[PDB]
Amino acid sequence: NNPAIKRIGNHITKSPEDKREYRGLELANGIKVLLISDPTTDKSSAALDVHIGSLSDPPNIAGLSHFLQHMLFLGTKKYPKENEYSQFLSEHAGSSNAFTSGEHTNYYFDVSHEHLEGALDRFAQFFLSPLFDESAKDREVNAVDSEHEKNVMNDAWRLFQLEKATGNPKHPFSKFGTGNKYTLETRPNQEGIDVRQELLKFHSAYYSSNLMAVVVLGRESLDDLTNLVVKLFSEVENKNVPLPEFPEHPFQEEHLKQLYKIVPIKDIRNLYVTFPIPDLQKYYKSNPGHYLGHLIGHEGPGSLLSELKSKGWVNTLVGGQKEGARGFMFFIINVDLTEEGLLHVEDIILHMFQYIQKLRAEGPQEWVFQELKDLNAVAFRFKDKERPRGYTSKIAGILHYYPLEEVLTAEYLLEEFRPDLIEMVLDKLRPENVRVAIVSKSFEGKTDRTEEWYGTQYKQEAIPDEVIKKWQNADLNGKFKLPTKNEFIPTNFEILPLEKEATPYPALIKDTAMSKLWFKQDDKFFLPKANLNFEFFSPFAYVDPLHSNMAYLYLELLKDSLNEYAYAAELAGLSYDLQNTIYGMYLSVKGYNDKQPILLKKIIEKMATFEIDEKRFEIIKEAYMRSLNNFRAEQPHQHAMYYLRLLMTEVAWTKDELKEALDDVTLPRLKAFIPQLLSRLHIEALLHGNITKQAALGIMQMVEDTLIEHAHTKPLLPSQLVRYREVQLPDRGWFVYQQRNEVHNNSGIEIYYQTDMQSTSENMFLELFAQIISEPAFNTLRTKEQLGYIVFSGPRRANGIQGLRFIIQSEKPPHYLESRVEAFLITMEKSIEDMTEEAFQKHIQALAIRRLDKPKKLSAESAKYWGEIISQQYNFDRDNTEVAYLKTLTKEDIIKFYKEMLAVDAPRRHKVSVHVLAREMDSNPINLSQAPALPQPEVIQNMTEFKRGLPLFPLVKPH
Numbered sequence: 001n002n003p004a005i006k007r008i009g010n011h012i013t014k015s016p017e018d019k020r021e022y023r024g025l026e027l028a029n030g031i032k033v034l035l036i037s038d039p040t041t042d043k044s045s046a047a048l049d050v051h052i053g054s055l056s057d058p059p060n061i062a063g064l065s066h067f068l069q070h071m072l073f074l075g076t077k078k079y080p081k082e083n084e085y086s087q088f089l090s091e092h093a094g095s096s097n098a099f100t101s102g103e104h105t106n107y108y109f110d111v112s113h114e115h116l117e118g119a120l121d122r123f124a125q126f127f128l129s130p131l132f133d134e135s136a137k138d139r140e141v142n143a144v145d146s147e148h149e150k151n152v153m154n155d156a157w158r159l160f161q162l163e164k165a166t167g168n169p170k171h172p173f174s175k176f177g178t179g180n181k182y183t184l185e186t187r188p189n190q191e192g193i194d195v196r197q198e199l200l201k202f203h204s205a206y207y208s209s210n211l212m213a214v215v216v217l218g219r220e221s222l223d224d225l226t227n228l229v230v231k232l233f234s235e236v237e238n239k240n241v242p243l244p245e246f247p248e249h250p251f252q253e254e255h256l257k258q259l260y261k262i263v264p265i266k267d268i269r270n271l272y273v274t275f276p277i278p279d280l281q282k283y284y285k286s287n288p289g290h291y292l293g294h295l296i297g298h299e300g301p302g303s304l305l306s307e308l309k310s311k312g313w314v315n316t317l318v319g320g321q322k323e324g325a326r327g328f329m330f331f332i333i334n335v336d337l338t339e340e341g342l343l344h345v346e347d348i349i350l351h352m353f354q355y356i357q358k359l360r361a362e363g364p365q366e367w368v369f370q371e372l373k374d375l376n377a378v379a380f381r382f383k384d385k386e387r388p389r390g391y392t393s394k395i396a397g398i399l400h401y402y403p404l405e406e407v408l409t410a411e412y413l414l415e416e417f418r419p420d421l422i423e424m425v426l427d428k429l430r431p432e433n434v435r436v437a438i439v440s441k442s443f444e445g446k447t448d449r450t451e452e453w454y455g456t457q458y459k460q461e462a463i464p465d466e467v468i469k470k471w472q473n474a475d476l477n478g479k480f481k482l483p484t485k486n487e488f489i490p491t492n493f494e495i496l497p498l499e500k501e502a503t504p505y506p507a508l509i510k511d512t513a514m515s516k517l518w519f520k521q522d523d524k525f526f527l528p529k530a531n532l533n534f535e536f537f538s539p540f541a542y543v544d545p546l547h548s549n550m551a552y553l554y555l556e557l558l559k560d561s562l563n564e565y566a567y568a569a570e571l572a573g574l575s576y577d578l579q580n581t582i583y584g585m586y587l588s589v590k591g592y593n594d595k596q597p598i599l600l601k602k603i604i605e606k607m608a609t610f611e612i613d614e615k616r617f618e619i620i621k622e623a624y625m626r627s628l629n630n631f632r633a634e635q636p637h638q639h640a641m642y643y644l645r646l647l648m649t650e651v652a653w654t655k656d657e658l659k660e661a662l663d664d665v666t667l668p669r670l671k672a673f674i675p676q677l678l679s680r681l682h683i684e685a686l687l688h689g690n691i692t693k694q695a696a697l698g699i700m701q702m703v704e705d706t707l708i709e710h711a712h713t714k715p716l717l718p719s720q721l722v723r724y725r726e727v728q729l730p731d732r733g734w735f736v737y738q739q740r741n742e743v744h745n746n747s748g749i750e751i752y753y754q755t756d757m758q759s760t761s762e763n764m765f766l767e768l769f770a771q772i773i774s775e776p777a778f779n780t781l782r783t784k785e786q787l788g789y790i791v792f793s794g795p796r797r798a799n800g801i802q803g804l805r806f807i808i809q810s811e812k813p814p815h816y817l818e819s820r821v822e823a824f825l826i827t828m829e830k831s832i833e834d835m836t837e838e839a840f841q842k843h844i845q846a847l848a849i850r851r852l853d854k855p856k857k858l859s860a861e862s863a864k865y866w867g868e869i870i871s872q873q874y875n876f877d878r879d880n881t882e883v884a885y886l887k888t889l890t891k892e893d894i895i896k897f898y899k900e901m902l903a904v905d906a907p908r909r910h911k912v913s914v915h916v917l918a919r920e921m922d923s924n925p926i927n928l929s930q931a932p933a934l935p936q937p938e939v940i941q942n943m944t945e946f947k948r949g950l951p952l953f954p955l956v957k958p959h
C-alpha cells in the first residue's frame with residue numbers, strides 16, 4: 001500500500017537469545033534500512049553509511065571525502081548553528097562520530113532514549129542541506145592537518161600509504177586518503193579551486209539515496225520507527241549513482257616478485273609477505289580465504305609459527321585475507337623478526353612456501369570447515385549484546401553487502417563447503433605472485449627512495465630469479481602438520497538456575513589471610529560464560545626497577561610457553577590475560593565457562609613450576625629493551641600523561657630507570673626471582689557469571705592449593721598490603737614540568753587541577769562541572785580556536801584522589817595553550833551564571849543518564865565491580881547513591897565549587913602542568929577571549945625532589 005516504501009523484508013534472522021526486535025526495508029528512493037526495537041535500552045542510536053569514500057576523491061583535491069565528513073557536523077539549512085548537533089547530543093547524554101574508508105563514509109550517534117527523534121532530525125539534515133560555511137571550512141582544515149601530522153611519524157600509517165605508493169599509480173588505490181592543509185587549502189588556492197564549491201559538487205554528486213544504508217535503534221515500536229525513518233529520509237534525493245568498482249588489481253605484473261627495504265621510526269623488525277588475490281567477498285557463505293587464514297595463521301602444534309619460533313627467527317605471526325576494495329583483495333603473512341631472523345628472511349619465506357605446499361598436498365579438509373562452522377555458530381548464538389552506537393554503525397556498513405534478512409548472520413554463519421574455492425585461492429599463494437617488505441633500522445642510510453606523503457625511506461629491488469625458484473621448489477617439511485581436533489570447543493551451555501541466596505551485587509564469600517573472594521552469579525545475561533579475575537599482591541613485584549623488569553619478563557616468558565596450548569582455547573571462545581602490576585600480578589580468564597577450570601589450572605600450574613628456556617629468555621629480553629626505548633616515539637600528549645603519572649604517584653619507576661636495570665637481569669637472577677615472588681601472596685578475586693557459589697569456592701581454592709603445593713606460598717601480613725598515595729599539592733600552588741619529544745614535531749600538554757579525596761559530594765561536584773564544560777571546551781578550544789586535533793577535558797582519578805584535567809596536542813607552544821585554557825575557564829564561569837535553570841537541570845539529567853546506563857554484556861558489569869575492588873572502595877551501589885545526590889545539586893553549589901577550587905584566584909587551586917615541547921622547539925617560556933594573567937610557576941627540575949618536598953594524601957576508606 002505505502003508508496004514511500006519499496007519493500008519490507010521477511011523475518012530478519014537473529015540469535016534466539018537476542019530479545020531485540022528487527023525489521024528491514026528498502027525505501028522508495030533506494031535507502032536500505034534496518035530498524036532495531038529495544039524497549040529496555042537506555043541510549044538510542046542511529047547510523048548512516050554512504051557507499052562512497054576516498055577512492056572517489058577528485059585527483060586534484062586529495063582527501064576531499066574525509067574533509068566533507070568533518071563538515072557535515074558544522075551546520076545545515078534547518079539547523080544552522082555550527083555546533084547545534086554537538087550541543088544537542090551533549091545535553092541529552094549523546095555522542096557522535098564518523099570515519100571514512102576507501103569505499104564508505106559512516107556516520108553514527110547515540111543519545112538518551114527519550115530524545116531519539118530530536119537527534120535523528122538534526123542528523124538527517126547532514127544528507128539534505130548542509131551549509132559548508134566558509135568560516136567553518138577555513139577553521140576545520142586545521143583539524144585535518146593536525147590529524148595527518150599526528151600520523152606522520154606513525155609506522156603503521158607510513159606502511160599503509162607506502163603500499164598504495166608502490167602499486168599502479170594510475171589506480172585509485174594510490175590516492176592519499178587523509179588530506180592535509182596542503183591538499184585541502186594551500187594547493188587548491190593556487191589552482192583557483194573554490195573548495196566550498198567542490199564540497200557541494202561532491203556531496204550533490206555522490207550523497208545519493210541509492211548508495212545509502214540507515215540503521216535506527218530505540219525503545220519505539222517497529223511500526224513507530226518505520227514511520228519515523230520514512231518521515232526523515234524519504235526526502236533524500238535519488239541520483240542513481242553507479243557504484244564504483246575496481247576490477248583491475250592495483251598490483252600488476254611489474255609490481256610482483258618485488259622486495260622493499262624500509263626504515264622505521266620505532267626500532268622494530270618486521271617481515272610482510274603479500275599476494276594479490278581476487279575479491280572473495282561474494283563467497284561469504286563459503287569463506288575460502290578465512291579457511292586458509294585459519295590454517296596458515298595457526299599457532300598450535302605443527303603450525304608454521306611453531307617452527308619459526310623454535311628456530312629463533314620470529315616471535316609472532318598473523319595471516320589471512322586483507323580487504324582492498326570491490327574487485328581486489330590481498331592475502332598477507334606478517335611475522336616479526338628476531339635479530340637472527342632478520343638474517344634469514346629468505347629461509348623464513350621458504351618455510352612459508354613449504355607450509356603452503358603442505359596444504360596443497362593434503363587438499364581441503366571438510367572437518368576443518370566443519371569446526372570453523374560450529375565455532376561461528378556457537379559464537380553467533382551466545383554473542384554478547386552490543387552497545388547500541390557501535391551496533392548500528394556496524395550494521396549500516398554491511399547492509400551494502402548482504403540481503404536484509406541476512407545482515408545479522410552474514411558474517412557469522414557458514415553454509416557451503418567449497419574445496420574448489422580453497423584450491424583457487426591457494427593457487428594464488430605462489431612465489432611468482434609475491435611481494436616482500438622488510439622493516440629494519442639496519443636499512444638506515446642504505447635507502448634510495450622517499451615516499452611523498454609521509455617521507456618513508458625505502459629501497460626497491462627485484463627478487464633474484466634464482467631465489468624465486470628455490471621458493472617454487474619448496475619441498476615438504478616434516479615439521480609441518482595440520483592441527484588436530486580442537487578439544488577446547490565447548491559443549492556444555494547449560495545455564496545454572498539462580499541460587500536462593502543469590503545477590504544483586506558481588507558478595508564477600510571468603511576472607512582469609514591468603515585470599516578475598518567476591519562472587520556473583522549472573523542474574524541478567526544468562527549466557528554460558530564467566531569472568532574469573534584475580535589480583536595477586538606481592539611487594540617484590542615493584543620493590544625496585546630490577547624486580548619490576550623481572551616480574552614483566554617472567555609473565556612474558558610464561559605466556560610465550562603457554563601460547564601453543566592456549567591458542568586452541570582462544571579459538572574456542574576461552575581467552576586469558578596475564579600481566580604484571582605495580583602491586584603484583586593480574587590474571588583474567590573470560591569466555592565459555594565449560595572448559596574454563598582446565599585452562600585456569602594449567603596457567604597456575606605453569607606459573608608455580610615454570611622452567612625458563614634460555615634461548616627464549618634472551619630473545620624476549622631483547623624485545624623488551626626495544627619496547628622501552630620505543631617510548632621515545634609515542635605522541636606528545638601521551639608523554640605528558642606519562643610524566644604526570646610519574647609526578648603524582650608515591651612510587652613509580654621511569655622507563656629510563658627500567659632500561660638501566662634491564663642489563664643486570666641475568667638468567668640465574670630471574671630463576672631466583674620467581675620462587676621469591678610466589679613465596680608470599682595475597683589473592684583478591686572476582687568470580688562472576690554462569691557459575692555457583694560452590695564452584696567459585698572450589699575455583700578459588702584450586703588456585704590456592706596449586707600455589708601452595710608447588711610454590712609453598714604463605715599469606716602476606718595485612719600491613720604489607722599497602723596502596724600508593726597521590727602527592728598532595730599546596731593551596732594556590734602551580735608547578736610545571738617540561739620535556740621535549742624528540743620524534744614528533746607537535747607539542748603536548750596536560751593540566752591537572754587537583755581537588756580533593758574522592759567522596760560522594762566531591763565526586764559529583766567535579767563530574768557535573770565536567771559535564772557542563774565538556775562540549776563547550778571542545779567547541780571553544782578545537783572547532784573555534786583550532787588548537788589541535790586532540791582536545792580533551794574531564795575528571796582524573798588516581799589513588800583515591802581526583803581533579804579536572806585538560807589534554808591538548810598542538811603546533812602552538814604549551815605556554816600558549818596554558819593561557820587559552822585559562823581564558824576558557826573564565827568563559828565557563830560566566831556561561832554558568834548566565835545559563836537558565838532548566839539548562840542546568842538538563843546537564844544534571846544528562847550526567848544521570850550516563851551514570852545509570854545499564855551494562856549490556858557480562859564483561860561490562862564485571863568491569864564495574866572490578867573497579868570497586870581494585871580501588872578498594874567496594875562501593876557496588878555507587879551509581880544509585882551518587883545520582884540521587886547529584887539531582888539535589890544547585891547552580892549555586894557549582895559556582896562555589898569553581899570559586900573555591902578552580903578559578904584562577906581560587907583559595908584552594910592546586911595546579912600542576914606537564915609541557916612536552918615539539919621536536920623543533922629549542923626552549924619555550926584579536927577575535928579571541930582575554931586570558932587572565934598567571935603567576936610565576938615553580939619549575940620542577942627533579943621528580944624525586946618534587947615528591948619528597950610535599951605531603952602525601954591519605955587513602956580512601958573502604959565502604
Ligand SMILES: Cc1cccc(-c2ccc([C@@H]3[C@@H](CO)N4CCCCN(S(=O)(=O)c5ccccc5C(F)(F)F)C[C@@H]34)cc2)c1C
Binds near residue numbers: 156273319322
Ligand atoms: C611495500 C609493501 C609491500 C608489501 C606489503 C606492505 C604492507 C602492506 C600493509 C601493511 C599493513 C600495515 C599498515 O599499513 N599494517 C601493520 C600491522 C599489521 C596489520 N595488518 S596485518 O596484521 O598484516 C592484517 C591486516 C588486515 C587483515 C588481516 C591481517 C592479518 F593479520 F591477517 F595479516 C597489515 C599491516 C604493512 C605492509 C608494504 C608496505
